[PDB]
Design a binder for these strands. Structure first.
Ligand SMILES: [Mg+2]
Lengths: 452, 412
DNA sequence: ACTAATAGATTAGAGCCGT
RNA sequence: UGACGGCUCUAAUCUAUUAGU
């Protein structure tokens, strides 16, 4: 008989430091941790796209009721949740003609096609930023379906990448999402039906817009102080790999600071997904210096986690650049071995947060399960748990589980209950997808607002 | 004294608005009395003695609700005795309610507009409350926190009863007590595949590692008759299972690797005699039932082969045996599709698309029952099934998966 | 040293549907 | 690319071992 320990849900801080377990409830009830004065929109689309965007903004002004209000919380309205104003009449609209898109699409070179499609939008964005005195906080790109389907060296990745040197928060919204009712797959019904999940769509879009405009919808507090939760992701370039790091830590005021820690670390090696000692030493020196400048003193622990296992050489380099009094914990999180738990009598999956301890150096954690708070399980099918292995260093296998579960609750790109994989890894993955989509940057911005 | 703000509304529909507003007002230090937040005698009592304001969540149904108009009727009465014209405050929320269908007891009054956005309406409501000098306590998040949890943050509660979870791990009941390293390097003809032997065997170094004995390989491996059965290295498996065995000839890691390879090959071989039809995956081996092999194409009162539109879906499994944490046979569920139940559709995209749609129908219990019934078919004896690795050497697999018990449950 | 084979492992990706 | 999740198809590396160059 195998015993499953349980890890309880962590609490995320909201306005006035009040705690809750669901962003969709904590925000609607309490309000964001930091409030902004308002959001100046910026739209780069057609007249059709501008009309759609204004319609959607005014629609989310009013409360949004989704079909199953009990399982997924309703949307009070943008100003009702966040406390700032987001009007559809303050749009600094920059028109894009379908004809110039058409002449771009007719070019033989696909790489030049996607480069020119990115260039159109980004150059219009740059022109407005440098010419229009109207301050724009977030630029919302209402792209048509032709861009999405004809152009497939990715539109989104390059577009986010080529704006990094100018530091402009952007939000791509395909017109299929905003006008889903009038986008039908010739059957007479929408291509993807948002009817029962309209409120959750409003939640996600509004949260993404609020975050990118300088607001912090919620912050974490249920993590150990003095620890720099650091995540690495490796991305393929074809025979080079590209490491990207994201770091989360508590400050002097006990406020979680979540920021990227990315520097170029390119390794070309037969043995892939490993770092040379120089790259690793750079990596760790950058992270430690960032913690030092944010808090003064050095961390009491460097909780390095990744989807891969570390070899000896890079760990020795890590230890060599590490000062004294600081411990290093290298944790590998894998989601490949199928351990599907079926409940004996019933029809709803295992509760989220259950944890199976293999031994002192490994565990299974069900970061995806059935959450009673929303009554809606995060997985349609049986949820595969994440295998958390303490690859290197000394740690408590339950403490690592609770730390990972806490790190699974800071996805600002979506206002879901919690993320299946820890957020630092997923955001580092997004950074790697973007930072490797254009030319090398001397100093990429360390704020996710520009990436997600 | 009367220091409470009564909130009236339709019971099954206006819950969302009133819940937000009541919690919003409570968070600001007010004392709110809502039926959802908190019998007719009681309702009247508050409106008659406890209530200081009567906020009417007005909508196209709250004015057609017989029980609400009664609360309005008593509210009209109480308003007179208090000599307060500003007692009933008609919060209009419904979009289509436009000041022409209002009930006569509220039409003479000016509403607070919530039709265009709730935030300005709450801004309007608070303005009216202060204009009318309604007293309010400090918005302490303590007693107010209690109401918040009693409403939602107590619901977060996790039922603390014990549940039983059926996984997909099938432990290996038994292994042969000894691992043998035979020598047929001089007896192995060039170009012969070790995979074609009747029993599982792996060619490690200048040897042949298998769980069978020397003479077990005679037809497949020629000249083994002349071979001295003393040309073999013996290794207690339990020693390697504990990791104790680590000689310069072979390490514990490599020996366990060879054990896993033997396990997988033995599973593949037994499936050939078990009469299951094989479908190749990208990096694993799937097994499913040809239509008609089962009685009525179902077993243990659980359908394992069925029909989806023009295609036939076949429940399938793939096995990979692991020694960590402990020796088990990890089984994975799959769905395979055939045209007329005979031959497999040769389009991977079509197979994937058919499965993605078929997956919607099946549930937790549906997958568990199908997996357990499909495994129980493998059973040779009452409570297990054996995998052949030698002439007299068997490995026993529990036909039931490992049970996992948890201290936590939900309402279900 | 360097290629080929048989594995098992460990990681990438590309993809395609569901909600 | 509002999202999340499951799955499917490729691909390489690592390690061991043999073969060959
Ligand atoms: Mg985003």
């Amino acid at each position: 008989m195998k015993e499953l320990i349980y890890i309880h849900e962590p609490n995320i801080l909201f306005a006035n430091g009040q705690k809750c377990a669901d962003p969709r409830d904590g925000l609607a009830l309490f309000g964001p941790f930091t409030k902004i004065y308002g959001i100046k929109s910026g739209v780069v689309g057609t007249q059709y796209g501008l009309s759609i965007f204004k319609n959607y903004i005014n629609h989310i002004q009013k409360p949004i009721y989704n079909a199953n209000n009990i399982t997924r919380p309703m949307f009070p309205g943008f100003e009702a949740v966040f406390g700032c104003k987001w009007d559809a009449d303050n749009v600094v609209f920059k028109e894009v003609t379908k004809e110039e898109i058409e002449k771009i699409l007719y070019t033989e070179s696909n790489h030049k096609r996607t480069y020119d499609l990115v260039s159109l939008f980004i150059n219009k964005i740059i022109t407005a930023n440098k010419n229009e005195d109207e301050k724009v906080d977030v630029w919302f790109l209402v792209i048509p379906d032709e861009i999405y389907q004809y152009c497939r060296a990715q539109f989104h990745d390059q577009l986010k990448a080529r704006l990094l040197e100018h530091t402009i928060p952007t939000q791509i919204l395909r017109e299929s999402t905003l006008a889903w009712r009038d986008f039908k797959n010739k059957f007479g019904a929408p291509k993807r039906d948002f009817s029962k999940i309209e409120g959750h769509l409003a939640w996600t879009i509004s949260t993404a817009a609020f975050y990118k405009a300088g607001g912090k919808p919620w912050k974490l507090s249920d993590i150990r102080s003095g620890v720099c939760y650091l995540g690495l992701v490796y991305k393929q370039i074809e025979p080079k790999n590209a490491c990207c790091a994201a770091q989360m830590f508590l400050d002097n005021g006990d406020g979680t600071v979540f920021k990227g820690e990315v520097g170029p670390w390119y390794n070309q090696e037969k043995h892939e997904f490993h770092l040379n000692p120089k790259e690793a030493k750079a990596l760790l020196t950058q992270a430690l210096n960032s913690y030092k400048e944010q808090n003064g003193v050095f961390p009491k622990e460097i909780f390095i986690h990744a989807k891969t296992k570390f070899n000896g050489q890079e760990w020795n380099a890590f230890q060599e650049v590490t000062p004294e009094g600081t411990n290093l914990v290298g944790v590998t999180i894998t989601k490949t071995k199928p351990l599907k738990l079926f409940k004996s009598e019933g029809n709803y999956p295992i509760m989220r947060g259950n944890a199976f301890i293999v031994n002192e150096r490994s565990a299974f954690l069900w970061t995806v399960g059935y959450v009673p708070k929303t009554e809606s399980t995060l997985s349609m099918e049986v949820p595969n748990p994440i295998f958390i292995e303490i690859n290197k260093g000394e740690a408590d296998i339950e403490q690592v589980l609770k730390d990972v579960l806490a790190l699974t609750k800071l996805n600002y790109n979506a206002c879901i209950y919690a993320d299946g994989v820890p957020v630092t890894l997923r955001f580092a993955d997004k950074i790697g997808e973007i930072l490797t989509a254009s030319t090398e940057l001397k100093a990429p911005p360390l704020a996710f607002k520009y990436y997600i | 004294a009367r220091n409470k703000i009564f909130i009236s509304h339709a019971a099954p529909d206006d819950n969302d608005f009133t819940k937000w507003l009541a919690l919003k007002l409570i968070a600001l230090g007010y004392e709110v009395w809502c039926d959802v937040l908190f019998f007719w005698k009681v309702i009247d009592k508050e409106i008659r003695e406890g209530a200081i304001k009567f906020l009417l969540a007005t909508s196209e149904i709250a004015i057609k609700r017989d029980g609400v108009l009664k609360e309005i009727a008593v509210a009209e009465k109480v308003k007179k005795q208090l000599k307060d014209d500003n007692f009933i405050i008609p919060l209009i929320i419904d979009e289509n309610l436009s000041y022409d269908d209002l009930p006569p007891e509220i039409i003479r009054l000016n509403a607070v507009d919530f039709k265009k956005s709730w935030a300005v309406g709450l801004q309007d409501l608070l303005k009216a409350l202060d204009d009318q000098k309604v007293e309010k306590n400090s918005p302490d998040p303590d007693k107010s926190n209690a109401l918040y949890q009693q409403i939602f943050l107590h619901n977060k509660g996790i039922i603390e009863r014990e549940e039983i979870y059926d996984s997909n791990w099938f432990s290996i009941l038994s292994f042969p007590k000894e691992l043998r390293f035979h020598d047929y390097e001089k007896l192995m003809p060039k170009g012969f595949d070790v995979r074609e032997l009747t029993y599982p065997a792996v060619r490690y170094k200048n040897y042949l590692c298998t769980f069978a004995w020397e003479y077990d390989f005679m037809h497949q491996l020629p000249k083994t008759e002349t071979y001295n059965s003393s040309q073999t290295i013996r290794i207690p498996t339990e020693e390697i299972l504990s990791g104790k065995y680590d000689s310069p000839f072979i390490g514990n890691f490599e020996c366990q690797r060879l054990i896993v390879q033997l396990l997988n090959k033995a599973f593949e071989l037994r499936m050939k005699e078990k009469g299951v039809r094989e479908y190749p995956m990208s990096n694993k081996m799937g097994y499913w039932f040809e239509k008609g092999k089962l009685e009525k194409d179902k077993f243990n009162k659980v359908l394992l082969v069925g029909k989806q539109k023009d295609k036939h879906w076949h429940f399938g499994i793939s096995a990979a045996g692991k020694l960590y944490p402990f020796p088990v046979l990890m089984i994975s569920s799959h769905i395979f599709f055939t045209k007329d139940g005979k031959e497999l559709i040769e389009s991977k995209k079509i197979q994937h698309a058919a499965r993605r749609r078929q997956g919607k129908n099946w549930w937790n219990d549906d997958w568990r029952n199908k997996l357990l019934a499909f495994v129980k078919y493998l059973s040779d004896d009452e409570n297990s099934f054996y995998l052949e690795v030698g002439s007299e050497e068997k490995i026993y697999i529990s036909n039931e998966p490992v049970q996992f018990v948890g201290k936590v449950s939900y309402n279900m």
